[PDB]
Structure 1
Amino acid sequence: DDHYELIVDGRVYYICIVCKRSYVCLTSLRRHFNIHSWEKKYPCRYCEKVFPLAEYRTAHEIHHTGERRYQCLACGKSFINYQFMSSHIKSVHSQDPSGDSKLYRLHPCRSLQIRQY
């Protein structure tokens, strides 16, 4: 028992009973709620750190391996995450990768095992 529902204008919101954060879908509330309950743990496999979300652990573990998955297509430089890539493309190439063009390539993750696309 971790939420209540709030309905405004026919739109359904799921509210965390602990911190009152609002979610459009229940899956997100359940993913969020682990921060409170710590029902599941996500331990780094390279150090002692433990995370409340699987994706937080993954981003952290990529830091351990040093893999650079985000590649700028304008000059070929590669980056650890979206933020480094975006900062680069905006500052050096004066372009926005969230725009209407494909300015970067996200390589598959090869330095560790996560599900592929």
Structure 2
Amino acid sequence: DDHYELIVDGRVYYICIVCKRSYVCLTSLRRHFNIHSWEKKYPCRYCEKVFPLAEYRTKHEIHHTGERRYQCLACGKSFINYQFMSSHIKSVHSQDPSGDSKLYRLHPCRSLQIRQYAYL
């Protein structure tokens, strides 16, 4: 439980006492600070292998599962994550997923128990 604040013309920043990275949101600092702290543990439910960040465990765990939640809408081809989905659409369809319109679908996560977004 420590960090320090830094104020530049209005904007407040939060600096990590250990490694001194900056953060616009205290939330993000707390989440990061664990890398040092290890106050919380996020063990994989499939191997004895532990993560310092919830989300780090999640992508690891979807990986065990093989679920392919990202679907290219141009051709139906599915993918395990954003990164591979985006490489596909860019290199095969010469389009940018972040650009302007929806080129993919992100299916709800069905293969394990995580939070489920009412918009997904």
Task: Provide the TM-score with structure 2 as the length reference.
Answer: 0.95
CA contact (8 A) 1:15 1:23 kept: yes
Instruction: Give CA deviations for 1:26-53 in whole Å, capped at 9, x if unaligned.
Output: 0110010011000000000000110000
CA contact (8 A) 1:70 1:80 kept: yes
CA contact (8 A) 1:72 1:89 kept: yes
Other structure's SS at 2:63 match: helix
Cα distance in structure 2, aligned partners of 1:33 and 1:72: 36
CA displacement at 1:112 relative to structure 2: 0.2
Gaps of 5+ in 1: none
In the alignment, structure 1 residue 26 sits paired with structure 2 residue 21:
no
Other structure's SS at 2:18 match: coil
CA displacement at 1:10 relative to structure 2: 1.2
CA displacement at 1:86 relative to structure 2: 0.1
Other structure's SS at 1:7 match: strand
Task: Provide the TM-score with structure 1 as the length reference.
Answer: 0.98
Matched positions, count: 116
CA displacement at 1:2 relative to structure 2: 1.7
Gaps of 5+ in 2: none
CA displacement at 1:15 relative to structure 2: 0.2
CA contact (8 A) 1:2 1:18 kept: no
Taking only the aligned residue pairs, the percentage that are identical comes to 99
CA contact (8 A) 1:70 1:82 kept: yes
Runs (4+) off by over 2 Å? none
